[PDB]
């Protein structure tokens, strides 16, 4: 199979000052978050045509030499400082997906978290400007564009839960956010390497197994090829594609801080032999950010869950995800 109910929510009021309109958006976010857990944000104001075209030009023009120079430590032992940021290589005949991950552009050598060598903070690596003109400028601008959309969404989630609109957004700051952009290429391959196809317990051929996201929320642009499925009690359901909207879901940090009132939906990626793009922005807070858990089901909102520092959550969650679902 069946198809998931994934509503399209006009999020434009979240950028404005009509408070009643904001509440009507928040109600729709609440409804979706308590149902399948996914919704499409529409009327978001981001030029997703330029995003997809510039990402395609990068993926199609980068060479093996450049990939080694940008590779994370899993693929290049020389790059001990690149655990998150850099290029994640495909393995011809074995691993189809490749991607490029970048972090907060404000993470420079002058940044105190970099000076202190705090885990999960890294300085971005970029290709040579003369080989990829304008790519770094585009990607950094995009980070702030999607940061802005994400800030607005976080106001909607706060209002949906009965909190003041800055409840989450006050911890989502340009100077310290651990948020990341990943530019993922899923290629068309003929023949397609069987090693890159996993078989689910229910027989479905997959590119990436079931998981909960390591994030507060995930803000995803994908090209118009259906691939995602969400788990419900009655089985997995297909999420329809829409290459004009952003697909939104909660990560496991939201589930923790709400005592599972907004669950982190379990989802997986079906195998499809088609050239496509998957461009997630993982909304992460700062390393020291802590939100006191609460339970919206209780009159008093009391929760017995321990507050969890975002940095420790993220460090543990990224490693766990690699261990469970494989090095991407
Ligand atoms: C969506 C995408 N899946 C993914 O990106 C999967 C599951 S959400 N996520 C990851 O591998 C975590 C990337 C974290 C990133 N390197 C960072 O340091 O922040 C897909 O299409 O496979
Ligand atoms: Fe995911």
Describe this structure in words.
The protein is α+β, with helices and mostly antiparallel strands and 328 residues long. The chain has a single domain (1-328), classed as Jelly Rolls (Sandwich). Helix content is 27%, strand content 20%. The chain contains seven helices and 13 strands. The chain has helices at 19-34, 48-61, 64-70, 112-115, 135-160, 252-257, 310-325; strands at 8-10, 38-42, 86-88, 98-102, 180-186, 198-199, 205-211, 217-222, 228-232, 235-238, 246-250, 267-270, 276-283. An eight-stranded mixed sheet has the order 1-2-11-8-13-5-4-3. A five-stranded antiparallel sheet has the order 6-7-12-9-10, with no helix packed on it. Helix 1 crosses helix 5 (135-160) and helix 2 (48-61) packs across helix 5 (135-160). The radius of gyration is 19 Å and the shape is globular. The chain starts with 7 loop residues before the first strand and ends with a helix. The structure holds L-D-(A-aminoadipoyl)-L-cysteinyl-D-valine and fe (iii) ion. L-D-(A-aminoadipoyl)-L-cysteinyl-D-valine binds next to strand 5, strand 7, strand 13 and helix 7.
């Amino acid at each position: 199979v069946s198809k998931a109910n994934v509503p399209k929510i006009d999020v434009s009021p979240l950028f404005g000052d009509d408070q009643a309109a904001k509440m009507r958006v928040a109600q729709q976010i609440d409804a979706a978050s308590r149902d399948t857990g996914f919704f499409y944000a529409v009327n978001h104001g981001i030029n997703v045509q330029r995003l997809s075209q510039k990402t395609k030009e990068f993926h199609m023009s980068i060479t093996p030499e450049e990939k080694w120079d940008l590779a994370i430590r899993a693929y290049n032992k020389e790059h001990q400082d690149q655990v998150r940021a850099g290029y994640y290589l495909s393995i011809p005949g074995k691993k189809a997906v490749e991607s490029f991950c970048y972090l907060n552009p404000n993470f420079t050598p002058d940044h105190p978290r970099i000076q202190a060598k705090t885990p999960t903070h890294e300085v971005n690596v970029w290709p040579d400007e003369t080989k990829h003109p304008g790519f770094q400028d585009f990607a950094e601008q995009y980070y702030w564009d999607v940061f802005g959309l994400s800030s607005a969404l976080l106001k909607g989630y706060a209002l949906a839960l009965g909190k003041e609109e800055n409840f989450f957004a006050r911890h989502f700051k340009p100077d310290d956010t651990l948020a990341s952009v990943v530019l993922i290429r899923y290629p068309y391959l003929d023949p397609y390497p069987e090693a890159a196809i996993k078989t689910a317990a229910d027989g479905t051929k997959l590119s990436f197994e079931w998981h909960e996201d390591v994030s507060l929320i995930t803000v995803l642009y994908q090209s118009n090829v259906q691939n995602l499925q969400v788990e419900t009690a009655a089985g997995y359901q297909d999420i329809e594609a829409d290459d004009t909207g952003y697909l939104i879901n909660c990560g496991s940090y939201m589930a923790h801080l709400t005592n599972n009132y907004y669950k982190a939906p379990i989802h997986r990626v079906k195998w499809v032999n088609a050239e496509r793009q998957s461009l997630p922005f993982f909304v992460n807070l700062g390393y020291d950010s802590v939100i006191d858990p609460f339970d919206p089901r209780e009159p008093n909102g009391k929760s017995d869950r321990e507050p969890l520092s975002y940095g420790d959550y993220l460090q543990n969650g990224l490693v766990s995800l690699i261990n469970k679902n494989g090095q991407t």
